[PDB]
Design a protein around this nucleic acid. Structure first.
Lengths: 174, 149, 126, 52
RNA sequence: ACUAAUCGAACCAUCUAGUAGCUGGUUACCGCCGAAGUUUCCCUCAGGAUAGCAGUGUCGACCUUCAGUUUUAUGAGGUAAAGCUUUAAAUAUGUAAGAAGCCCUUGUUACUUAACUGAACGUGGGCAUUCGAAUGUAUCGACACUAGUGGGCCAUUUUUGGUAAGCAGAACUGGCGAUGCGGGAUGAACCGAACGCGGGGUUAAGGUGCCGGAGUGGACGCUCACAAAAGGCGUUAGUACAUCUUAUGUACUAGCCCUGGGCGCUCAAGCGU
């Protein structure tokens, strides 16, 4: 959903006399902005435990940037979505230079092949595939294969849309 | 519009589309806004948003009349009894919420804002966390005011 | 239980007694007293129609009317607003007497030590 | 007869806010931050950022 | 329609512009304010009165007060969790939030009680420059005459009874009967927005291939056109089991398709983000 960023959101129960210094739960949340990152954080936390936004506070929101966004790597995303039938789990593989780019890849991919929106989709675990042969996926496998070199046939050239008429029939060999 | 959110918008002086008002964050007020969330957008304004609103669209309620804040004299006649003597005081009292926020904010007529330059989001009638333009949005009200004001 | 003429009583309408039962529009509503009889108690209660209020007069027996605790917070407040004002004028110091609506929280610092923040995640369907 | 915007019209701003002449003169919209060597990020903050 | 057969029997002027119901009609302009089907009480059917909502005037205090709102305190309801009905809560919903107020002291009474035990009428105090929450302020209160509806319709929500399924009835809210504008290729639905006459700027709902103002715009995938654990040797996406120097092959899950406005479109001008 948009240019998402990663957010580290830490929060805990509002302290009472009975429980000073509460437990300080932390979650990693992909969101377009901070007010969505905090909303997803309370949505999950009320799902697992009894804490709510009204009785809870947020102690930090921090952006987790990519360590090496100029390196290309393979990502494994564990996933959970609610359909009309029910909830199912699957695992996709993506090839991007960053984790937020792979989550961007997932959200468009999941909405296309399965018609799942942001509310139904739950991130389980996104982890960099450190070593080859941990790639369990065919279309990534041909890409990680040795000495990849493919042609680009039938590339339609960029003709400007405001040049309605052309004098020469275009060539598709570039 | 049901009559219960209708009464609140009258009490918050939001009687028209594209109408602005400063309110205090308070458990009395915060529960009042949450009911009329299907009708409003709200957030936290910065110093600049407070400054440009008072300077460009700042109007005063002088004997029930909407008088534009043109000279410093017209603040002395109305709010000199609370120590506010100039425009920079009225900005200071609102931004840094002082002991006389209530008399300062009621002095100002509600801000008749224009439509935003650049438009709203495609479906502005959803919450901001679901891609719309409604409800709380915190520091992003500064971008909304900049397009509007 | 005993009841005056003019105090505040609240109706509960239990299912034990069925004699002269008020409607479901009259269960659980608070009102004032204008008549006290051997069993029935005359109750004045407002009614909400359209934009206004109309007053209705009824009779409810003693089996479901209880003394109202509505103005209990008042008699506590005026008594306490009195004795703090005596302590204020004796000591010559000002005291905030009204109620504040619980202003939003100020800023503070939370230390990491002894509390390593645990990393959570959603769970699968199994 | 005619409300003039002090943000556009510099004369109305000076009538309303006489400090506005010396704000731009001494350039307090461009106040440089206080000098001094900034400390490194603590190592414990880096692990909590890049945690699993 | 015609013929045969069937039933009946006047006219004139006046009373008389008879009366009853029920139709049709009812004559310049502009400005301001603007509704209703609803509460209580009677009695012939043939329906009355009243309350409301409204218009003109008129009179008394001064936004003190008030309020389809929140908050604080306290009732009332069901549904999970939960304990051995109490527990904590959703959701709407009563009451109170000072000087028109409090507490206790002391007398009386026609009332009540063992008794100021209470109730009523009289004594005492204190805060009038935080008078004891927030927000609002175009504050009200009270008279007359004079209307029009007083018996409806639609939608939501709740609730009740019931059918083979239907359906039926209330109450609440919004609306209609009394509404123009942009959209919905069209609309009595719905979405936006409610209205003096003009100029400029920005938008909403909806759109940007042509008709039509606006993108043949950008990223990534899929497709070639009733109904069931249904048939697919069509394609893609995911899961679970088995072989392997001793790449596979079986069954499912999800897409979506074959069977079950015009022009035109197919690396869309379709679908999802």
């Amino acid at each position: 959903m948009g240019r998402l960023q990663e957010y580290q959101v830490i929060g805990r129960h509002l302290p009472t006399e009975a429980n000073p210094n509460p437990a300080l739960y932390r979650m990693r949340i992909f969101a377009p902005n901070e007010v969505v990152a905090k909303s997803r954080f309370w949505y999950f936390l009320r799902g697992l435990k009894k804490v709510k936004k009204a009785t809870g506070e947020i102690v930090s929101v921090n952006v987790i940037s990519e360590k090496h966004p100029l390196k290309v790597k393979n990502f494994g995303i564990w996933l959970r979505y609610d359909s009309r039938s029910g909830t199912h789990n699957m695992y996709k593989e993506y090839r991007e230079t960053s984790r937020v780019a792979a989550v961007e890849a997932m959200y468009a991919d999941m909405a296309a092949r399965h018609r799942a929106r942001f509310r139904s989709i739950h991130i389980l675990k996104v982890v960099e595939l450190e070593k080859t042969e941990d790639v369990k996926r065919p279309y990534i496998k041909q890409l990680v294969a040795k000495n990849l070199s493919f042609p680009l046939p039938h590339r339609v050239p960029k003709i400007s849309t405001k040049k309605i008429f052309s004098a020469k029939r275009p060539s598709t060999f570039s | 519009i049901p009559p219960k959110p209708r009464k609140i918008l009258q009490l918050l002086r939001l009687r028209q589309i594209n109408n602005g008002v400063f309110v205090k964050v308070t458990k009395a007020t915060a529960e009042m806004i949450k009911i009329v969330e299907p009708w409003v957008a709200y957030g936290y304004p910065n110093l600049k948003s407070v400054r440009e609103l008072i300077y460009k669209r700042g109007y005063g309620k002088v004997n029930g009349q909407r008088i534009p804040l043109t000279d410093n004299a017209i603040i002395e006649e109305n709010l000199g009894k609370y120590g506010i003597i100039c425009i920079e005081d009225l900005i200071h009292e609102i931004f840094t919420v002082g002991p006389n926020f209530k008399q300062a904010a009621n002095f100002l007529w509600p801000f008749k804002l224009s439509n935003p330059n650049g438009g709203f989001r495609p479906r502005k009638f959803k919450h901001f966390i679901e891609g719309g333009d409604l409800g709380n949005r915190e520091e992003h009200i500064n971008a909304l005011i900049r397009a509007m004001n | 239980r005993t009841y005056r003429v003019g105090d505040i009583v609240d109706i509960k309408v239990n299912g034990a007694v069925q004699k002269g039962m008020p409607h479901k529009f009259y269960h659980g509503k608070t009102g004032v007293v204008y008549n006290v009889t051997k069993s029935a108690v005359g109750v004045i209660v407002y009614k909400r129609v359209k934009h206004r209020y109309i007053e209705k007069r009824i009779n409810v027996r003693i089996e479901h009317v209880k003394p109202s605790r509505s103005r209990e917070d008042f008699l506590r407040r005026v008594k306490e607003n009195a004795e703090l004002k005596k302590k204020a004028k004796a000591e010559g110091v000002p005291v905030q007497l009204k109620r504040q609506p619980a202003m939003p929280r100020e800023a503070h610092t939370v230390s990491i030590a002894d509390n390593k923040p645990v990393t959570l995640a959603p769970v699968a369907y199994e | 007869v005619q409300k003039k915007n002090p943000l556009r019209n510099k004369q109305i701003m000076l009538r309303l806010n006489p400090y506005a002449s010396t704000f731009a003169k001494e350039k307090l919209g461009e106040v440089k931050a206080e000098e001094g060597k900034p400390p490194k990020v603590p190592a414990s903050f880096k692990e909590l950022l890049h945690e699993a």
